[PDB]
Design a protein around this ligand. Sequence first.
Ligand SMILES: [Fe+3]
Ligand SMILES: [Fe+3]
Ligand SMILES: [Fe+3]
Ligand SMILES: [Fe+3]
Ligand SMILES: [Fe+3]
Ligand SMILES: [Fe+3]
Ligand SMILES: [Fe+3]
Ligand SMILES: [Fe+3]
Ligand SMILES: [Fe+3]
Ligand SMILES: [Fe+3]
Ligand SMILES: [Fe+3]
Ligand SMILES: [Fe+3]
Ligand SMILES: [Fe+3]
Ligand SMILES: [Fe+3]
Ligand SMILES: [Fe+3]
Ligand SMILES: [Fe+3]
Ligand SMILES: [Fe+3]
Ligand SMILES: [Fe+3]
Ligand SMILES: [Fe+3]
Ligand SMILES: [Fe+3]
Ligand SMILES: [Fe+3]
Ligand SMILES: [Fe+3]
Ligand SMILES: [Fe+3]
Ligand SMILES: [Fe+3]
Ligand SMILES: [Fe+3]
Ligand SMILES: [Fe+3]
Ligand SMILES: [Fe+3]
Ligand SMILES: [Fe+3]
Ligand SMILES: [Fe+3]
Ligand SMILES: [Fe+3]
Ligand SMILES: [Fe+3]
Ligand SMILES: [Fe+3]
Ligand SMILES: [Fe+3]
Ligand SMILES: [Fe+3]
Ligand SMILES: [Fe+3]
Ligand SMILES: [Fe+3]
Ligand SMILES: [Fe+3]
Ligand SMILES: [Fe+3]
Ligand SMILES: [Fe+3]
Ligand SMILES: [Fe+3]
Ligand SMILES: [Fe+3]
Ligand SMILES: [Fe+3]
Ligand SMILES: [Fe+3]
Ligand SMILES: [Fe+3]
Ligand SMILES: [Fe+3]
Ligand SMILES: [Fe+3]
Ligand SMILES: [Fe+3]
Ligand SMILES: [Fe+3]
Ligand SMILES: [Fe+3]
Ligand SMILES: [Fe+3]
Ligand SMILES: [Fe+3]
Ligand SMILES: [Fe+3]
Ligand SMILES: [Fe+3]
Ligand SMILES: [Fe+3]
Ligand SMILES: [Mg+2]
Ligand SMILES: [Mg+2]
Ligand SMILES: [Mg+2]
Ligand SMILES: [Mg+2]
Ligand SMILES: [Mg+2]
Ligand SMILES: [Mg+2]
Lengths: 163, 163, 163, 163, 163, 163
Amino acid sequence: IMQKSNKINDALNQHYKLNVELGLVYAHYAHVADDEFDMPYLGKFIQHLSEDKLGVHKEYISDYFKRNGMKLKTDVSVAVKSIPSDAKALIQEVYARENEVRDHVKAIAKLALAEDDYESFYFIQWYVRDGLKDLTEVDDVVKLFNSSNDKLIIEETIKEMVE
Amino acid sequence: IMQKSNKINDALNQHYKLNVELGLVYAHYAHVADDEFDMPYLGKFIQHLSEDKLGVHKEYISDYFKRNGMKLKTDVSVAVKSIPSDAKALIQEVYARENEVRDHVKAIAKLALAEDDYESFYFIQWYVRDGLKDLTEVDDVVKLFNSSNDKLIIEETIKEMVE
Amino acid sequence: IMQKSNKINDALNQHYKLNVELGLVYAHYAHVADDEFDMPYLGKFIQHLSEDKLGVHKEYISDYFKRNGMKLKTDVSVAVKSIPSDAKALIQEVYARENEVRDHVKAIAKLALAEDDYESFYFIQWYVRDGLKDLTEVDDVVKLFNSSNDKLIIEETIKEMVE
Amino acid sequence: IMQKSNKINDALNQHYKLNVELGLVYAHYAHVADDEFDMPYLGKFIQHLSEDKLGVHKEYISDYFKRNGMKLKTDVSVAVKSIPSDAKALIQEVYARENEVRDHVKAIAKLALAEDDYESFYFIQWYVRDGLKDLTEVDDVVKLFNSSNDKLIIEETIKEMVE
Amino acid sequence: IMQKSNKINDALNQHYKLNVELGLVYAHYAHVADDEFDMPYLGKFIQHLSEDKLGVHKEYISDYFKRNGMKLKTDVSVAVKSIPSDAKALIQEVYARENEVRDHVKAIAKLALAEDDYESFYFIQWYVRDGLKDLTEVDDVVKLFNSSNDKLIIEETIKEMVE
Amino acid sequence: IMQKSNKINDALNQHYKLNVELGLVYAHYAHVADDEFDMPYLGKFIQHLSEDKLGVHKEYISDYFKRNGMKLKTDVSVAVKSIPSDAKALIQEVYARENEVRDHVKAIAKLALAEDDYESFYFIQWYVRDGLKDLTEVDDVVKLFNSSNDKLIIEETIKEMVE
Ligand SMILES: [Fe+3]
Ligand SMILES: [Fe+3]
Ligand SMILES: [Fe+3]
Ligand SMILES: [Fe+3]
Ligand SMILES: [Fe+3]
Ligand SMILES: [Fe+3]
Ligand SMILES: [Fe+3]
Ligand SMILES: [Fe+3]
Ligand SMILES: [Fe+3]
Ligand SMILES: [Fe+3]
Ligand SMILES: [Fe+3]
Ligand SMILES: [Fe+3]
Ligand SMILES: [Fe+3]
Ligand SMILES: [Fe+3]
Ligand SMILES: [Fe+3]
Ligand SMILES: [Fe+3]
Ligand SMILES: [Fe+3]
Ligand SMILES: [Fe+3]
Ligand SMILES: [Fe+3]
Ligand SMILES: [Fe+3]
Ligand SMILES: [Fe+3]
Ligand SMILES: [Fe+3]
Ligand SMILES: [Fe+3]
Ligand SMILES: [Fe+3]
Ligand SMILES: [Fe+3]
Ligand SMILES: [Fe+3]
Ligand SMILES: [Fe+3]
Ligand SMILES: [Fe+3]
Ligand SMILES: [Fe+3]
Ligand SMILES: [Fe+3]
Ligand SMILES: [Fe+3]
Ligand SMILES: [Fe+3]
Ligand SMILES: [Fe+3]
Ligand SMILES: [Fe+3]
Ligand SMILES: [Fe+3]
Ligand SMILES: [Fe+3]
Ligand SMILES: [Fe+3]
Ligand SMILES: [Fe+3]
Ligand SMILES: [Fe+3]
Ligand SMILES: [Fe+3]
Ligand SMILES: [Fe+3]
Ligand SMILES: [Fe+3]
Ligand SMILES: [Fe+3]
Ligand SMILES: [Fe+3]
Ligand SMILES: [Fe+3]
Ligand SMILES: [Fe+3]
Ligand SMILES: [Fe+3]
Ligand SMILES: [Fe+3]
Ligand SMILES: [Fe+3]
Ligand SMILES: [Fe+3]
Ligand SMILES: [Fe+3]
Ligand SMILES: [Fe+3]
Ligand SMILES: [Fe+3]
Ligand SMILES: [Fe+3]
Ligand SMILES: [Mg+2]
Ligand SMILES: [Mg+2]
Ligand SMILES: [Mg+2]
Ligand SMILES: [Mg+2]
Ligand SMILES: [Mg+2]
Ligand SMILES: [Mg+2]
């Protein structure tokens, strides 16, 4: 009498895929921030976000599926074929992707209510809140590039954020 | 006077890609071991191996590239399109893939000597040793399925291995 | 039945001499960084590298010779007859010399294999790894001069590196 | 795709046999050093070397075989049919045998590279280093017999070495 | 007025030889128990018994000889030319050899009284008691193979015995 | 109104050079004491003196120059082209060089007073005292070779001095 929603199943499989692929992209951007742009703390901030997407962001869905009978799907393809031209544009790109996360998460909450899937509406509340948190942390680094022209000042300020 | 080997660069980019894709496959197999085969400790063993491949196995290469000027490439595609039929065949599949890792790692060591790239030969020694270690840990779980017909006995024995 | 290689003996005596003379040059550059360029932390970084070259870098060879019957040779001549014009070029010079160290160390590893001197190949692995480490630490200071125009910002950033 | 080298298998079985038989000989020499030559600390030094050869020196090979599918062979024959005439010649004999160990270990490293068996080249690095260490510790006792004519002085000096 | 018995000297040299050769055989059986029969705890039990035979069982005799003027003889030959077909028969074989130890030890006690060698009768009391102890510990593992058909149950039970 | 004395500048640059070159010679003699003469504690005593000359003895001058505007000069050449024939003559040679240090240091103090350079007279007081201290410590080892014919007795006595 509690059959899982296929629509929610698909939307969460899509979101699983987004977090894997985002995490793989951020792992690359973390590398570039350190190696090419000489900003290892910016690299550490982005690497932390990468391990976040490839960790709890995907594991919570996988665990959730175990409990309710939804089917997990692993279908992944991502190629980092060009890189932003400097550190500001790099973190600006990360921002734009985190903003899209908020839009994807919102669609899932809306769908969960349309499906009368209150377990799924409960489960997604965490993503609803974290969408704004991850976006805010990234926004706190974007602001640094408009507040100083000095890479090492910026780096020094980031070091108190991923501490 | 210390220009990086393109051949080693490619072979390590390929190995980076193998560890990402293997890690994504193992994350799926971990899920199935718990959810479908009712073996959450086998699932915990495979999840640990997944986080190993998607963690230090790929990060050491990325860090190494930063030091020597090799170029990191992120080009990933993996789809888990069928799953082994039971827990024994699942861990047997994991075994077969770890055995292939040893063959890939051996080719890189051999290439590093052919290139007179002793930094790369040093760097790969860790993978040379870990290839046998990961294979042995997986082999220690395969043996359980030939030693008992009782899933819960096996599960109980695995619990002292990923402890 | 285990007679020491004269070729390895000479190559390690040459490397002993390189580390003494490099260490004496860096001791001078450390002085100049502090006294002339007003960068005492850059001076502390270079002094640490000096004591590294004049310490374990030369002592490991001397100890090794004691064990295998190779002959130690002390033949040293170095004069610091001009100094780079500013702090950036100073650390750039240190970089260029550490990069040459990697090339010298690589020749010794290659020779050890050609001689079937596996004790010497083992012994040099430490230098193979440290060549990249010392180069990376120096590279981490070079990057600072391209990341800021402010000596005191740079100095402040170096202070968290030789801490 | 990772089939074990029979040549390495044989060379390591031979080395297993050497460490057993050497250990049995040293256990006898330890006895004689104490009982016949009145040098119990020299006896303790040689007994420690005996337990070294009959312990980790043979166990590491046996463990290694478990991991890679090589076959262990136990084929042992040793008879101590004459004993050196005094303590100096006793420790001189031990020295000569440890020097031969270095030659045997070197042949195995060389063979491992010829076989492209990098797991075996990794595994033998420990023996490559320990060959010089055991030889050096034994050499440190040989030197005592050329530095003093007084057994009890020598004994007293050995007591700070196997401490 | 206290001249050592040659008969006891020979019987203890023979027993020294038995403990060396038994210890070498058990080291091999320990390997097989783990590697071939997938029972590493059974392997750990047999390895412990091996180090027992090759340790105090032989050292007590060697020490005893030092005190009373008996001559130590090292004459060793052992080849493990076939292995029992499964774990039960392996531990059954170990049992049969430990039972023979009790018979050999009993002959020495009897001889010591016939020789009026009360020091030797005292010295052998330890072996008289340990013969039954080692036999009992081995018997406690034999019983497991008649109490369960499940290798992993047996393994789990052995793990609380060599703990 | 406080212009640095060129004469003191030269005399301290010469003394800087003496301590570097002496330190390099002692590092070699330390090696020989251990390796050739079988006296590792004598080697440890001489190595400590080497690190003394190449450390504070040269660094105090370099630091002093930073404070008063004197120019540091690095002009070093030393070759150890023959070695004394035995341990006594080795330490006798070290003694003779430390005695010359006292004469060089005395000339600098005398010059500092002739120049009315009381900062330089203050600065050299440390060297005035250390000249006698280093000479006394070396003299305490020379005395050992006239007090015993037994290398190991001497070695044992040195071990309580560089402790
Ligand atoms: Fe569907
Ligand atoms: Fe976080
Ligand atoms: Fe599921
Ligand atoms: Fe792209
Ligand atoms: Fe940038
Ligand atoms: Fe998050
Ligand atoms: Fe600041
Ligand atoms: Fe700060
Ligand atoms: Fe701060
Ligand atoms: Fe290419
Ligand atoms: Fe692990
Ligand atoms: Fe890079
Ligand atoms: Fe598939
Ligand atoms: Fe199953
Ligand atoms: Fe691993
Ligand atoms: Fe249990
Ligand atoms: Fe249990
Ligand atoms: Fe338990
Ligand atoms: Fe030569
Ligand atoms: Fe350092
Ligand atoms: Fe030497
Ligand atoms: Fe110059
Ligand atoms: Fe400057
Ligand atoms: Fe270094
Ligand atoms: Fe700060
Ligand atoms: Fe600050
Ligand atoms: Fe700070
Ligand atoms: Fe064969
Ligand atoms: Fe030891
Ligand atoms: Fe085996
Ligand atoms: Fe013999
Ligand atoms: Fe003697
Ligand atoms: Fe050893
Ligand atoms: Fe003493
Ligand atoms: Fe004493
Ligand atoms: Fe003492
Ligand atoms: Fe007899
Ligand atoms: Fe026991
Ligand atoms: Fe004896
Ligand atoms: Fe047999
Ligand atoms: Fe079996
Ligand atoms: Fe026993
Ligand atoms: Fe149980
Ligand atoms: Fe239990
Ligand atoms: Fe238990
Ligand atoms: Fe002048
Ligand atoms: Fe001192
Ligand atoms: Fe200056
Ligand atoms: Fe000379
Ligand atoms: Fe001498
Ligand atoms: Fe001094
Ligand atoms: Fe004494
Ligand atoms: Fe003493
Ligand atoms: Fe003492
Ligand atoms: Mg409604
Ligand atoms: Mg070649
Ligand atoms: Mg060759
Ligand atoms: Mg080849
Ligand atoms: Mg009677
Ligand atoms: Mg006057």
